């Protein structure tokens, strides 16, 4: 359905949250990959608000402790995914209308994401 | 960490050939896990130094299994079996209710600080499905809604599981359903 | 009756699970007062290793780990004299769903397994043994460590056993919860301290196992069954089952049935007998049955099926197989699409990743096909794709885990492709009724 | 010596030979990702699959010619329709999660994945049928990208096809286990807790990696593989 637009909007929202946590805690944030459907689109139109597909929070050593990804514009079963490397931890957020961004049934708030990122930093970050 | 207990190191390495010390990575990892709640890079480097191999090797080993946690976990890390039998016993709705009530993802922990959640595969007790494990302990079997909530309130009030009153009966090797 | 044991005939003797459940069954004093260690004591001084190997070869004891290899000819492949140390490996990793039989053996009657391992080690000239248990069985592990401590204290595991020139000792090794660690060649890596990825089989473990030594690995049920065999007859053991499925077996059942659980029963009992007489009959109408383990192909709930004897042959000629005897009944109330959905997601979680086909195809492709179908997104195109995907994975992988993932979906398609095409063409998610109380 | 027959040709071959080497010794070809010269072959990519007969007694399932020994008077089939179909399918499974970087990939013209893909993939199914390149229409594996492992080596964990080449080498040839997988399933990825890459022979994994996972930091983004002029010479830094 039309959930896609607000999904990419909340995707931009989550990216904003990651950037803010990075600037606050003084920890490296990285834009990992852009959309192939925007790179290789030659004349083809691009309606997505941003062209960024993958981002990460890396420690002082550059090894990530938090990874976040969004499904491409043309893939089936669209979702947003989170992963803690080395921690065998994976999260799958969808968007429910009216409620907002939810991991399954549990609302995914900015505070929730901040707490998860702080724990990930303290545990996994090598430096 | 293992500075304290060198007798335990001797005991575990004596179980393995002198050239097979790297076997001891498993018991060392397991002791660190059960004692501190999660495995730190310092623990992995120490296991490596004691056991005679690289921290990269030890990390590869440790990150291979599901039991080994590399992030802090609550005092009670509820490992919910979700496999076919347990689902046919309602593991789906059980996990949905637990996760939605506690408000936690598999990676994080309740703000109370004692409740973490995690899914797990077959715990090898299917006739008593659904099944749940608490961090080292024999499974809390025959998980009905009442048994779950009672275990929850008991742990919430600090009652040790081994002495908690659990409604309903759980068969040993067979169990009568009525 | 004409002499063949195929069910509830009154001349059957409970041997393995007999002392299971009785309080204090893990005490060495209990085990002795019921006649324990008499069999090891006699055989160690009377019979030679070749003789205790030929005894099991005559018993026709086939592997109880799910494979079914004849343990006698299996032991006949050991070097049988080389000067090198041999190791005996007990596989107490019980990770396949629907199989909970070894758990209670380990928890309540460890000394039976210990006696069987003493027998097997004498047979294969193994002076040391390791018992690799999964890290989810802690009560069983405590009872096993305690029983080994007891045997070491009272002299059942020592430098020389019962005066004879044989030596034996066991060591416990707890796992960390990975299904692939049950594959006998990945278990060796896991214990040795590597990642539990299977090894190259052209060098066989009989000639090169743990730390290169000629090690032999046997199922817990097999080792436990060694003791009755040596105690009261090999013919007494062979008195049970069909011409190709000899001895008794620990059957286990779970699902919407009146009383699921474990039953020590002879080989050949019908599904009807098992579900009705023992399990008390179903609680709901069943659409299919998964006889052996999780990996076994489901068969519909038919009279000609319920009357089929559970054996290594009658299920073979029926398309399925008898892996662990762990029956799971699937009712009509749950969609086969959803059942194999959960099955494929579990196998994807538990893959080690060494093979590109298994790793990628299962953990990305098959699970996603099932997701699309059962989430109300699937198409007939997707069902045909899933249909054609299986032969590309089945034939060729480094370890059979890929085959154990594709086979249940193979039989599920062969019997319920209608359900898949229906859920696809209606764009309907799998039914989600309330199943738990 | 051992007598082998590859699909139309007869070969003498020493006994300890691999079936794959007997194939190429006969002049035929077969995909090759996991195995490497001077490294222990272990069937991981499952690309070297061929057919074997040892009687007409064909084996039931396909033999991994990289880890299959040769027997006297053995038949090896690399041209069967089923063999090429399985090769294409394995190529698809390998391409499942690849990041779509070929034009911007520093691996450029010489990518074993690219070349074996264009060699063996897309088997001729039977007209002017409109064929499909990819059936997998789901989200690909997205992990850490362009991570400097050391002042000389960069790591793209997405391009890794999870062969065993780099860890196998690190364990065998230099004897420095400073690289290994971390997680399992499809979450498997290359990492290290020894970050500096201590081994003085680390740079060879860059040549070994059949994909653009491990690339040379000192030559990153300089030219494409075909564009460079190759001068074969000898290094005069030390007397070897
Ligand atoms: C992927 C895989 C996983 C397995 N896991 C187990 C297991 O967890 N427990 C078990 O007893 N057998 C398991 N097996 C079967 C073993 O081969 C079996 O334990 C072994 O052959 C014992 O031989 P036996 O039955 O003759 O004693 C597994 C096999 C495969 C291919
Ligand atoms: S089939 Fe799967 S689990 Fe088995 S070795 Fe291959 S990748 Fe690992
Ligand atoms: S590794 Fe090979 S196939 Fe992948 S992007 Fe680079 S050139 Fe293309
Ligand atoms: S990084 Fe390259 S060499 Fe190493 S396993 Fe991956 S594809 Fe193979
Ligand atoms: S399915 Fe949950 S215990 Fe076996
Ligand atoms: S080439 Fe033989 S499997 Fe990789």
UniProtKB/Swiss-Prot annotation, chain A:
Enzyme class: translocase
Species, as recorded: Thermus thermophilus (strain ATCC 27634 / DSM 579 / HB8)
Function comment: NDH-1 shuttles electrons from NADH, via FMN and iron-sulfur (Fe-S) centers, to quinones in the respiratory chain. The immediate electron acceptor for the enzyme in this species is menaquinone. Couples the redox reaction to proton translocation (for every two electrons transferred, four hydrogen ions are translocated across the cytoplasmic membrane), and thus conserves the redox energy in a proton gradient required for the synthesis of ATP.
GO MF annotations in UniProt: ferric iron binding; quinone binding
Gene Ontology CC: plasma membrane
Compartments where located: Cell membrane
Keyword Membrane belongs to the record: yes
InterPro entries, A to Z: Frataxin/CyaY_sf, NADH_quinone_OxRdtase_su15, NADH_quinone_OxRdtase_su15_sf
Lineage: Bacteria, Thermotogati, Deinococcota, Deinococci, Thermales
Notes on the domains: Has a similar fold to the mitochondrial iron chaperone frataxin.
Gene3D superfamilies referenced in this protein's UniProt entry, alphabetically: NADH-quinone oxidoreductase, subunit 15 (3.30.920.80)
Family: Belongs to the complex I Nqo15 family.
EC number: 7.1.1.-
A Gene Ontology BP annotation from the UniProt entry: iron-sulfur cluster assembly
Keywords: Cell membrane, Membrane, NAD, Quinone, Translocase
Classification via SUPFAM superfamilies: Frataxin/Nqo15-like (SSF55387)
Reactions listed under catalytic activity: a quinone + NADH + 5 H(+)(in) = a quinol + NAD(+) + 4 H(+)(out)
Any Pfam family: NADH_Oxid_Nqo15
The protein's name: NADH-quinone oxidoreductase subunit 15
Gene: nqo15
Bilayer topology annotation: Peripheral membrane protein
UniProtKB/Swiss-Prot annotation, chain B:
Catalytic reaction annotation: a quinone + NADH + 5 H(+)(in) = a quinol + NAD(+) + 4 H(+)(out)
GO molecular function, one term: metal ion binding
Annotated S-S bridges: 142-170
UniProt binding sites for [2Fe-2S] cluster: 81, 85-86, 122, 126
Cofactor: [2Fe-2S] cluster
Cofactor binding summary note: Binds 1 [2Fe-2S] cluster. This [2Fe-2S] cluster is referred to as N1a.
EC number: 7.1.1.-
Gene3D superfamilies in the cross-refs: Glutaredoxin, NADH-quinone oxidoreductase subunit E
Membrane topology note: Peripheral membrane protein
Enzyme class: translocase
Keyword Nucleus: no
Major localization class: membrane
GO CC annotation: plasma membrane
Signal peptide: none
Keywords: 2Fe-2S, Cell membrane, Disulfide bond, Iron, Iron-sulfur, Membrane, Metal-binding, NAD, Quinone, Translocase
Cell compartment(s), UniProt: Cell membrane
Quaternary organization: NDH-1 is composed of 15 different subunits, Nqo1 to Nqo15. The complex has a L-shaped structure, with the hydrophobic arm (subunits Nqo7, Nqo8 and Nqo10 to Nqo14) embedded in the membrane and the hydrophilic peripheral arm (subunits Nqo1 to Nqo6, Nqo9 and Nqo15) protruding into the bacterial cytoplasm. The hydrophilic domain contains all the redox centers.
Free-text domain note: The subunit can be divided into two domains: an N-terminal four-helical bundle (residues 2 to 74) involved in interactions with subunits Nqo1 and Nqo3, and a thioredoxin-like C-terminal domain (residues 75 to 180) that coordinates the binuclear cluster N1a.
Similarity comment: Belongs to the complex I 24 kDa subunit family.
Protein name per the record: NADH-quinone oxidoreductase subunit 2
Gene (name only): nqo2
Swiss-Prot record, chain C:
Record's GO cellular component terms: plasma membrane
Alphabetic keyword roster: 4Fe-4S, Cell membrane, Flavoprotein, FMN, Iron, Iron-sulfur, Membrane, Metal-binding, NAD, Quinone, Translocase
A single MF term (Gene Ontology): quinone binding
Name of the protein: NADH-quinone oxidoreductase subunit 1
Localization: Cell membrane
Membrane topology value: Peripheral membrane protein
SMART domains: NADH_4Fe-4S
Family named by the database record: Belongs to the complex I 51 kDa subunit family.
Principal subcellular localisation of the protein: membrane
Catalytic activity: a quinone + NADH + 5 H(+)(in) = a quinol + NAD(+) + 4 H(+)(out)
Co-factor requirement: FMN; [4Fe-4S] cluster
Cofactor note: Binds 1 FMN per subunit. Binds 1 [4Fe-4S] cluster per subunit. This [4Fe-4S] cluster is referred to as N3.
Matching NCBIfam families: nuoF_fam, PRK13596.1
Entry comment, domain topic: The subunit can be separated roughly into four domains: an N-terminal domain (residues 7 to 72) ending with a glycine-rich loop, followed by a Rossman-fold domain (73 to 240), a ubiquitin-like domain (241 to 335) and a C-terminal four-helical bundle containing cluster N3 (336 to 438).
Residues holding NAD(+): 65-68, 96
Keyword set includes Metal-binding: yes
Gene3D superfamilies: 3.10.20.600, 6.10.250.1450, NADH-ubiquinone oxidoreductase 51kDa subunit (3.40.50.11540), NADH-ubiquinone oxidoreductase 51kDa subunit, iron-sulphur binding domain (1.20.1440.230)
EC number, UniProt record: 7.1.1.-
Binding site residues for FMN: 74, 91-95, 179-184, 217-219
Binding site for [4Fe-4S] cluster: 352, 355, 358, 399
Swiss-Prot record, chain D:
A GO CC term assigned to this protein in UniProt: plasma membrane
Keywords: 2Fe-2S, 4Fe-4S, Cell membrane, Iron, Iron-sulfur, Membrane, Metal-binding, NAD, Quinone, Translocase
Residues where [4Fe-4S] cluster 2 binds: 160, 163, 166, 209
UniProt GO BP: ATP synthesis coupled electron transport
4Fe-4S His(Cys)3-ligated-type domain segment(s): 82-121
Residues covered by the 2Fe-2S ferredoxin-type domain: 1-82
Quaternary structure note: NDH-1 is composed of 15 different subunits, Nqo1 to Nqo15. The complex has a L-shaped structure, with the hydrophobic arm (subunits Nqo7, Nqo8 and Nqo10 to Nqo14) embedded in the membrane and the hydrophilic peripheral arm (subunits Nqo1 to Nqo6, Nqo9 and Nqo15) protruding into the bacterial cytoplasm. The hydrophilic domain contains all the redox centers.
Protein family (similarity comment): Belongs to the complex I 75 kDa subunit family.
Described purpose of this protein according to its UniProt entry: NDH-1 shuttles electrons from NADH, via FMN and iron-sulfur (Fe-S) centers, to quinones in the respiratory chain. The immediate electron acceptor for the enzyme in this species is menaquinone. Couples the redox reaction to proton translocation (for every two electrons transferred, four hydrogen ions are translocated across the cytoplasmic membrane), and thus conserves the redox energy in a proton gradient required for the synthesis of ATP.
Name of the protein in its database record: NADH-quinone oxidoreductase subunit 3
Organism annotation: Thermus thermophilus (strain ATCC 27634 / DSM 579 / HB8)
Parent-protein start and end of this portion: 1 to 261 of 783
